[PDB]
Design a protein around this ligand. Structure first.
Ligand SMILES: *[C@@H]1O[C@H](CO)[C@@H](O[C@@H]2O[C@H](CO)[C@@H](O)[C@H](O)[C@H]2NC(C)=O)[C@H](O)[C@H]1NC(C)=O
Ligand code: TKE
Ligand code: TKE
Ligand code: NAG
Ligand code: NAG
Ligand code: NAG
Ligand code: NAG
Ligand code: ZN
Ligand code: ZN
Lengths: 279, 278
């Protein structure tokens, strides 16, 4: 509402001035994920996403004016980074970033390459913090998974990411206006993760990619994309932007690339990478 | 003599010309049916791993029916149980593709054909001392099926051809049968990391070319690795062998077989694996 992607008064170039804590920082996201300048760390294990089977509550999705954001009910979806299914990270939401055109859209790049859509699965560190509102603002409170998606011409519906999303229960269209929300069938996040290799990813400490760009995010970005069709990406593009945006249709809702180590950093960060127990 | 495209020697005739075992009831490929398969949680992630002290060369041949990578002995292995103790040793990798982008794979998944199916062939070194003893004996072989799908937008480094090191450029019109060329080693571990190695169909079946021996433990990964139209067209530049009717190599896949033909004496089951978590 005080920031946008496309209105030059409030757009990404202004965030460092409008939200200095912390959009002016030097641990910002997204970054270029560079295979050659990253350190392989064999101790980083396969990611698991898993559901509390006795959870009953509804999932919703909202056009928040900046993105399409799925809101998961509490105590329902989890991430494990350590092989133990003990509720260390609890998923809160998933939102999406895409392009006006198929050659751009993602926040992260991989060796300079932009994907048409990047999904962000946002969790809080339940191991330490009892609620999301406690975690969102505090050191080390968040972990986000970045899921790239690529467009293919030939695929069965059932093998695309939209199958895991249950097609968003058909809710995406021009009438889905900010700030409306709608109930949807649940997203099968375990199926989504099975559509890529969950051992192969970049890992680094960074930030939220929208203001206030808090530097409290443990980032994991999977290298292999899940697959969607051109028709599916088009469903996002019919969403309208909020009125504080210049462009009418929602698209190009991604932040410009940040450096891993701007010149003013007082302690450099390292980009790590993981791969499966093999090779 | 056999072929894919000559109606006189082609797949419809294999059951008669090679009755052992192309007339059997445990033949491959099959349609891999998600709904009519049994999830078996005990089936673990597949690992491919290299003996880092091997230095022997890899080669590729146009054998007249496919392009076949031949790996040196004692070099590349598969583990299905998480232990790296050389139970399965990889022998070769070959490929099946179509004249057009909408067919080419031997297996289907829920009826869908992919443009290119790779077959990583290994022998059960746990029981048999050499590829030549395992290839015609019970339980001798295990093959991995790798589906590939065409994308328009991708960097070369993220395509399967990075793992293949472009086959050192040997895929071209002048690569005539039965020439063989030395190639850079194929990074099969990287290839496997391009898909989810816990998510696969598993069943007992057969070689997909004569003599169709019924001694193959099949593993077919569900998620495809990615290639470009340019890359698929390289395979289509290869010439077929002189006993094919078609000139350029393509449609070198066997028709779909049933999991359980009517005459079967003991039905087989299609299994499915997925990663721990859900
Ligand atoms: C997935 O969701 C979309 C809606 O977001 C469905 O698209 C609709 O298709 C029918 C016409 O056959 C009409 O209701 C509308 O023209 C479409 N909506 C828009 C905006 O395109 C689509 O059918 C769904 N797909 C599946 C497989 O369920
Ligand atoms: N693009 S990104 O992935 O880097 C990113 C992620 C998240 C944010 C905003 C945080 N707000 C949340 S999750 N609110 C919230 C959380 C719990 C509850 I109960 C109510 C509200 C910004 C950017
Ligand atoms: N399409 S398929 O994947 O079902 C399939 C069909 C046919 C074969 C049999 C080929 N025999 C081999 S591997 N001879 C061989 C033995 C030792 C050596 I050194 C080199 C080669 C294998 C796989
Ligand atoms: C699982 O769901 C039940 C009922 O909603 C809930 O009371 C329980 O706490 C949940 N378990 C978690 C969050 O680990
Ligand atoms: C979502 O929509 C309804 C109906 O318009 C509204 O009353 C409700 O408070 C909204 N809830 C959320 C999740 O913001
Ligand atoms: C690995 O290769 C070395 C040297 O090439 C060889 O002597 C050794 O047997 C191999 N290890 C195996 C096959 O397990
Ligand atoms: C493989 O193919 C393309 C050539 O057009 C290229 O960009 C890539 O560098 C080649 N790599 C090797 C190892 O030859
Ligand atoms: Zn985001
Ligand atoms: Zn084969």
């Amino acid at each position: 509402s005080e920031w946008s992607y496309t209105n030059i008064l409030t757009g990404p170039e202004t965030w460092h001035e409008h939200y200095k804590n912390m959009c002016s920082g030097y641990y910002q996201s997204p970054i270029d994920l560079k295979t050659d300048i990253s350190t392989l760390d064999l101790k980083l294990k396969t990611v698991i996403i898993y559901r509390n089977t006795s959870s009953t509550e509804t999932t919703t999705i909202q056009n928040n004016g900046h993105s399409a954001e799925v809101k998961f009910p509490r105590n329902t979806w989890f991430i494990s980074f350590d092989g133990i299914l003990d509720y260390k990270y609890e998923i809160i939401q998933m939102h999406f970033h895409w392009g006006n055109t198929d050659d751009r859209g993602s926040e992260h790049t991989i060796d300079g390459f932009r994907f048409p859509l990047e999904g962000h699965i946002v969790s809080f560190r339940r191991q330490m913090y009892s609620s999301p509102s406690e975690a969102i603002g505090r050191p080390g409170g968040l972990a986000v998974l970045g899921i790239m998606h690529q467009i293919v011409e030939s695929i069965k519906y059932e093998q695309t990411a939209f199958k895991a999303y249950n097609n968003f229960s058909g809710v995406l269209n021009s009438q889905f206006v900010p700030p409306n929300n709608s109930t949807i069938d649940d997203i099968n996040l375990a199926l989504l993760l099975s559509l890529l290799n969950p051992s192969r990813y970049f890992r680094y400490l960074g930030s939220l990619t929208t203001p206030p760009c808090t530097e409290n995010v443990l980032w994991t970005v999977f290298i292999d994309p899940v697959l969607i069709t051109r028709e599916q990406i088009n469903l996002f593009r019919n969403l309208p932007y909020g009125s504080n945006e210049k462009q009418t249709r929602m698209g190009d809702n991604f932040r410009p690339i940040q450096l891993l180590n701007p010149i003013d950093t007082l302690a450099s960060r390292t980009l790590y990478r993981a791969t499966a127990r093999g090779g």
